[PDB]
Amino acid sequence: GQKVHPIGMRIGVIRDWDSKWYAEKDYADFLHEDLRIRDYVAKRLSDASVSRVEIERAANRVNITIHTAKPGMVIGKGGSEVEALRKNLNELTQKRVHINIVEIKRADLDAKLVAENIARQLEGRVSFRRAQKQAIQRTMRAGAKGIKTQVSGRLGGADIARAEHYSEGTVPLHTLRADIDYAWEEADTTYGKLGVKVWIYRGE
RNA sequence: CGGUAUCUAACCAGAAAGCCACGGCUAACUACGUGCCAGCAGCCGCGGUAAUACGUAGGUGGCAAGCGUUGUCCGGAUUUAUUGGGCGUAAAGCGCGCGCAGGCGGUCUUUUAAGUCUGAUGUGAAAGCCCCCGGCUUAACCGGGGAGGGUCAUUGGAAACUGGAAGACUGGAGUGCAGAAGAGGAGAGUGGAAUUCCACGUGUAGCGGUGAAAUGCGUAGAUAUGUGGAGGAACACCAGUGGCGAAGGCGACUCUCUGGUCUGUAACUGACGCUGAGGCGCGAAAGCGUGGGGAGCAAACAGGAUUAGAUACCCUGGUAGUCCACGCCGUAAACGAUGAGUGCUAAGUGUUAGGGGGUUUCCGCCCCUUAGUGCUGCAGCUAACGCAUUAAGCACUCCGCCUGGGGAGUACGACCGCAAGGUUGAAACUCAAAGGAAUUGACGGGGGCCCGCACAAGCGGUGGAGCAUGUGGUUUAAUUCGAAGCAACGCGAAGAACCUUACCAGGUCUUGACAUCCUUUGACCACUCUGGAGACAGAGCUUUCCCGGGACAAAGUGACAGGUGGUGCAUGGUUGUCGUCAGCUCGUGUCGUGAGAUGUUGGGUUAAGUCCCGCAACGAGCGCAACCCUUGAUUUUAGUUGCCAGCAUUUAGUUGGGCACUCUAAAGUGACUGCCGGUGCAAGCCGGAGGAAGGUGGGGAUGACGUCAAAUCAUCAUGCCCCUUAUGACCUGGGCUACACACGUGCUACAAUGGAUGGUACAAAGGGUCGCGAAGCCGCGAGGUGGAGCCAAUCCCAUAAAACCAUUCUCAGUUCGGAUUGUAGGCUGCAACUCGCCUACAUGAAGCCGGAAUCGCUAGUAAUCGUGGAUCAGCAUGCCACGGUGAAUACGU
Ligand SMILES: [Mg+2]
Ligand SMILES: [Mg+2]
Ligand SMILES: [Mg+2]
Ligand SMILES: [Mg+2]
Ligand SMILES: [Mg+2]
Ligand SMILES: [Mg+2]
Ligand SMILES: [Mg+2]
Ligand SMILES: [Mg+2]
Ligand SMILES: [Mg+2]
Ligand SMILES: [Mg+2]
Ligand SMILES: [Mg+2]
Ligand SMILES: [Mg+2]
Ligand SMILES: [Mg+2]
Ligand SMILES: [Mg+2]
Ligand SMILES: [Mg+2]
Ligand SMILES: [Mg+2]
Ligand SMILES: [Mg+2]
Ligand SMILES: [Mg+2]
Ligand SMILES: [Mg+2]
Ligand SMILES: [Mg+2]
Ligand SMILES: [Mg+2]
Ligand SMILES: [Mg+2]
Ligand SMILES: [Mg+2]
Ligand SMILES: [Mg+2]
Ligand SMILES: [Mg+2]
Ligand SMILES: [Mg+2]
Ligand SMILES: [Mg+2]
Ligand SMILES: [Mg+2]
Ligand SMILES: [Mg+2]
Ligand SMILES: [Mg+2]
Ligand SMILES: [Mg+2]
Ligand SMILES: [Mg+2]
Ligand SMILES: [Mg+2]
Ligand SMILES: [Mg+2]
Ligand SMILES: [Mg+2]
Ligand SMILES: [Mg+2]
Ligand SMILES: [Mg+2]
Ligand SMILES: [Mg+2]
Ligand SMILES: [Mg+2]
Ligand SMILES: [Mg+2]
Ligand SMILES: [Mg+2]
Ligand SMILES: [Mg+2]
Ligand SMILES: [Mg+2]
Ligand SMILES: [Mg+2]
Ligand SMILES: [Mg+2]
Ligand SMILES: [Mg+2]
Ligand SMILES: [Mg+2]
Ligand SMILES: [Mg+2]
Ligand SMILES: [Mg+2]
Ligand SMILES: [Mg+2]
Ligand SMILES: [Mg+2]
Ligand SMILES: [Mg+2]
Ligand SMILES: [Mg+2]
Ligand SMILES: [Mg+2]
Ligand SMILES: [Mg+2]
Ligand SMILES: [Mg+2]
Ligand SMILES: [Mg+2]
Ligand SMILES: [Mg+2]
Ligand SMILES: [Mg+2]
Ligand SMILES: [Mg+2]
Ligand SMILES: [Mg+2]
Ligand SMILES: [Mg+2]
Ligand SMILES: [Mg+2]
Ligand SMILES: [Mg+2]
Ligand SMILES: [Mg+2]
Ligand SMILES: [Mg+2]
Ligand SMILES: [Mg+2]
Ligand SMILES: [Mg+2]
Ligand SMILES: [Mg+2]
Ligand SMILES: [Mg+2]
Ligand SMILES: [Mg+2]
Ligand SMILES: [Mg+2]
Ligand SMILES: [Mg+2]
Ligand SMILES: [Mg+2]
Ligand SMILES: [Mg+2]
Ligand SMILES: [Mg+2]
Ligand SMILES: [Mg+2]
Ligand SMILES: [Mg+2]
Ligand SMILES: [Mg+2]
Ligand SMILES: [Mg+2]
Ligand SMILES: [Mg+2]
Ligand SMILES: [Mg+2]
Ligand SMILES: [Mg+2]
Ligand SMILES: [Mg+2]
Ligand SMILES: [Mg+2]
């Protein structure tokens, strides 16, 4: 049995899609500009635990906000790394780009950030059983009513692939008033390719 | 022996370390090579292009002057069990009795001293094991002393136990006396139902048989029916986990001859007993010999059916046999799968044959007791099932039997038999299992409830024809690759003329078509001419960068790039399918030696493990339901590009005017078993009212744990393997469109509910800026010119078609059908031959409802008719959406 994408099921119902701009006859021109912007942000800020990026476009001006769990590298004492973004985005956007940075409180509640921390341990030769369990017990203190995660692929170096999942709490997928986050990430190993799936039933 | 052992003097780290294993058993793991090959192995078993198991290295682990392998013996092996096992179902109780030898044997007294216990003497050599000392520089090794070792011989004691002898007793055993029950056995005779045959009345056409039939019997008169005769076998009701017997077994009645058992008494004898190898007898059915008998039944056999075949099941016949006398045979799931004797160890309740007591006149009820026969259950036992005073519990005596499976109850030998065969009973070889009980699933041509267009009741199709399209096969330089029952086959492909294109022919390039870092200029090109099929080769105009920075470009080099090359059985992600089926699990608790179980089962109800009640369980999670969208009714907000009530005007809702009504879209109401009646205890069920809507209203989105090593390395990503002057890169042409053929999916028809001609009405949902494209004019037509308006509730696409109204055709291969083909055109595109779509004229094919088989659909559904959109320069009979008209049937499982 195949499951619908939990995020996609709730667009426009309880949540709102990330890129929120309106234009006609410039749709494909604007849309692929965003796909370029996201590609560069995900490159330089690979270790900054960045999860949510949205595009706010209005009359030749590009407004972008970055949701970061640890903005200290992104902004703070240096005060010069964030300005390089506007200098490294003017060449491809060709528009006056302003970037905003927003703190993420309780970073363990965000399904995006939990995903790579599980993932980063898998190529650190950590057992798959331990890595998931450690993240499950960390998020339950944050205030979530549900979590279940699986890791699938050539598991622990095994020749035959299989999946393993661990759950505790309440994760009702079929409920539409759920507010369930989702994230999928790649674990790059020397025996193959592994992927992790995490979804959290948030509080409200 | 022999200048041997042994001392002291000096020089030298210098001459002196190998063997086996590293998956588990079992201490010790990583690389490379190979790729079910080479090979390894004591067992389990490893090797099929990431091997801790094969080969070699590095490292490690056991020992060490060694270390491994083989052969033999003991151990582990309780696997011959005296110490120290067993026989209900795993191997293992003879089919049963009578009994010689042997083994074992109630209570007391006296005696004896064979067994039993004990002392002394003699001996059991030396060496060896063991204990205490001593010598070799230690040890091994060697001495001194001691100990142990016997069913040993002579002799002295003890008398409890077994044995011997002499007596005594009665709880064992047996006799006597008084009763009782019984299909216990052998012999002789008799009875009644019923079947068959025979003879004679009555009578007419079938009888008999099967899932259906047929063979067979009958007009030579059957079946049926009434009367009489002959003969053989078994004994209806009674009849009962009732009775009798050692077992096999014994069922009509009477008599004769016979065996055993139970109860009561306490007269009698006084251990006279239990088991019992060899031996001797009995012993279902079939079978054998001799003489009878023969009604039903029936191996063999014959015929008829069934079947792909049917030496069978089914039907019609039928010989030995079954019955009797005598004599053999000696087996059985001969079973309670449980040897015989004896004693002890909770209860509850039926029944057979007796005895005692209390109530009562009897009857009857109750209690106690003996011997049998059943059921339920404690302790105990058991691997479990289960047994449980009729033990598989606790004990003693005697007999029989067993030691992994097959070979095999076979071969040879012997005994027995008339024969068939019986009894006794191996080995070579081969395997690492064979087996008992219970658990979770699955399966059933087992059973009980249920659901789905599953069948049934209907309607319309496919399979027959022409064309469209995908696939197989085949042909081709190539016909690029993938999917293969449901769950590939108008599928990836929501568009193959060049591109796409992944394939082929020819022509070309090697840091390259695409990115990074090198170094000099900084713009680099573009264009024109020539050879050009083009890619590309040779010349000129210009290359203006901007701000020491830069991205690209010029130039050659490297690191490098590039693969739609392989493996979907190395993978991530994505999807199908069972199936929108109602299930799948967990936490704590409890039961079981254990795997497991319970919850999740039982009684109702539901679409639903949806809910209620009960319950050794109490709760939870993913699923169901609801929350989401859409349609159906309505209120407030809002009147523009929408609408026109009431108006004046216009060819026309037009213009002026107004949101009245529709309308559009934001917020709300509304449906929740809400209410009433009956039924039920509750869930719930049936009906009714209100309402637009009533029982999850209609339709969508939503697809649990998992199964198919299901599909995709070709959307993307990616481990390993492979190619790299090519398996990478550019150009033209061809091909993916072939064609004797087979299959799947569709379109059009085979006409009169129809064809043709003329007039006219009624929609919804969408698209439009390098776009839609009107009026007007032209052409028979496809189309051409033209440019209005529209960045759109405004303008265009855009006249909806079936339907309705008139005329004509008159049942024919036709005024049906349109394939096919010749000519003449239009449109896109640089280009329409391979290979596009449309128009005009002419040609006019198969086809007159489709065999076997098979598909879809339950209401605005099927059926039928039009419309729009994605991909798109052009091209859809495919796909995805929209509306018009609008059925038949559902008894039922
Ligand atoms: Mg000398
Ligand atoms: Mg010396
Ligand atoms: Mg020295
Ligand atoms: Mg070990
Ligand atoms: Mg290897
Ligand atoms: Mg080994
Ligand atoms: Mg090796
Ligand atoms: Mg080595
Ligand atoms: Mg060593
Ligand atoms: Mg030594
Ligand atoms: Mg040796
Ligand atoms: Mg040996
Ligand atoms: Mg032994
Ligand atoms: Mg045994
Ligand atoms: Mg026994
Ligand atoms: Mg057996
Ligand atoms: Mg047996
Ligand atoms: Mg017996
Ligand atoms: Mg005797
Ligand atoms: Mg005695
Ligand atoms: Mg004796
Ligand atoms: Mg001696
Ligand atoms: Mg000494
Ligand atoms: Mg000695
Ligand atoms: Mg000595
Ligand atoms: Mg005595
Ligand atoms: Mg004496
Ligand atoms: Mg007596
Ligand atoms: Mg008798
Ligand atoms: Mg008799
Ligand atoms: Mg008679
Ligand atoms: Mg028939
Ligand atoms: Mg007659
Ligand atoms: Mg008896
Ligand atoms: Mg008698
Ligand atoms: Mg008698
Ligand atoms: Mg009796
Ligand atoms: Mg006497
Ligand atoms: Mg006896
Ligand atoms: Mg005998
Ligand atoms: Mg006989
Ligand atoms: Mg005979
Ligand atoms: Mg005879
Ligand atoms: Mg026959
Ligand atoms: Mg017969
Ligand atoms: Mg006889
Ligand atoms: Mg036999
Ligand atoms: Mg026998
Ligand atoms: Mg019997
Ligand atoms: Mg037996
Ligand atoms: Mg006994
Ligand atoms: Mg007994
Ligand atoms: Mg009894
Ligand atoms: Mg053997
Ligand atoms: Mg054997
Ligand atoms: Mg024999
Ligand atoms: Mg013989
Ligand atoms: Mg077995
Ligand atoms: Mg079994
Ligand atoms: Mg239905
Ligand atoms: Mg056809
Ligand atoms: Mg193909
Ligand atoms: Mg289809
Ligand atoms: Mg080409
Ligand atoms: Mg030039
Ligand atoms: Mg030139
Ligand atoms: Mg697969
Ligand atoms: Mg349902
Ligand atoms: Mg269960
Ligand atoms: Mg139930
Ligand atoms: Mg309901
Ligand atoms: Mg439920
Ligand atoms: Mg009511
Ligand atoms: Mg009603
Ligand atoms: Mg639902
Ligand atoms: Mg496969
Ligand atoms: Mg495949
Ligand atoms: Mg690849
Ligand atoms: Mg094709
Ligand atoms: Mg016509
Ligand atoms: Mg043409
Ligand atoms: Mg014509
Ligand atoms: Mg014809
Ligand atoms: Mg006709
Ligand atoms: Mg088109």
Side-chain angles (χ1 to χ4, degrees), chain A residues 1-19 21-24 26-42 44-46 48-51 53-60 62-76 78-104 107-204:
Chain A
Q2 287 69 240
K3 280 73 176 175
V4 68
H5 200 274
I7 290 287
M9 191 78 237
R10 277 149 194 98
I11 322 296
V13 187
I14 62 170
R15 65 176 58 246
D16 182 321
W17 51 83
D18 291 331
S19 63
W21 43 259
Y22 183 28
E24 185 53 40
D26 267 332
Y27 205 92
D29 190 20
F30 283 169
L31 165 67
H32 288 267
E33 195 181 7
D34 297 358
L35 268 66
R36 283 202 301 276
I37 290 172
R38 296 209 148 100
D39 186 74
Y40 187 51
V41 170
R44 55 194 304 173
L45 313 179
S46 177
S49 75
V50 63
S51 70
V53 180
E54 61 86 20
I55 295 92
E56 182 65 26
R57 205 185 304 262
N60 204 10
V62 184
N63 301 317
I64 182 171
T65 70
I66 304 281
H67 299 290
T68 311
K70 93 192 70 182
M73 294 182 286
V74 176
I75 195 173
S80 71
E81 58 273 33
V82 65
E83 61 86 20
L85 272 296
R86 97 178 303 156
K87 300 294 187 291
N88 269 334
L89 284 185
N90 269 321
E91 81 270 14
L92 61 83
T93 48
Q94 220 58 51
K95 294 181 176 67
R96 299 275 82 84
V97 170
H98 168 74
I99 184 168
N100 292 325
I101 307 157
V102 163
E103 178 70 27
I104 297 169
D108 291 331
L109 282 176
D110 189 358
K112 182 63 69 177
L113 314 173
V114 174
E116 69 275 16
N117 286 122
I118 300 184
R120 294 284 90 96
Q121 279 175 340
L122 265 295
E123 69 271 15
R125 272 79 169 267
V126 185
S127 67
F128 49 95
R129 288 176 55 244
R130 183 176 176 87
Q132 312 168 21
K133 292 181 181 179
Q134 294 293 106
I136 276 173
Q137 56 87 29
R138 271 195 300 283
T139 56
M140 272 309 207
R141 319 192 188 100
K145 296 183 290 294
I147 181 63
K148 68 181 178 67
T149 62
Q150 65 182 357
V151 170
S152 182
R154 286 180 90 195
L155 190 64
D159 284 343
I160 302 108
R162 54 191 174 89
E164 294 294 328
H165 46 279
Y166 294 130
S167 67
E168 87 178 19
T170 313
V171 191
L173 292 176
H174 290 227
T175 300
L176 293 172
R177 66 185 184 273
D179 173 356
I180 286 180
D181 291 331
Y182 185 66
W184 168 64
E185 294 294 328
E186 299 273 6
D188 309 273
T189 70
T190 45
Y191 283 78
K193 182 62 66 68
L194 307 194
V196 305
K197 288 206 208 143
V198 172
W199 39 82
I200 315 170
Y201 185 11
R202 273 183 139 143
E204 293 175 354

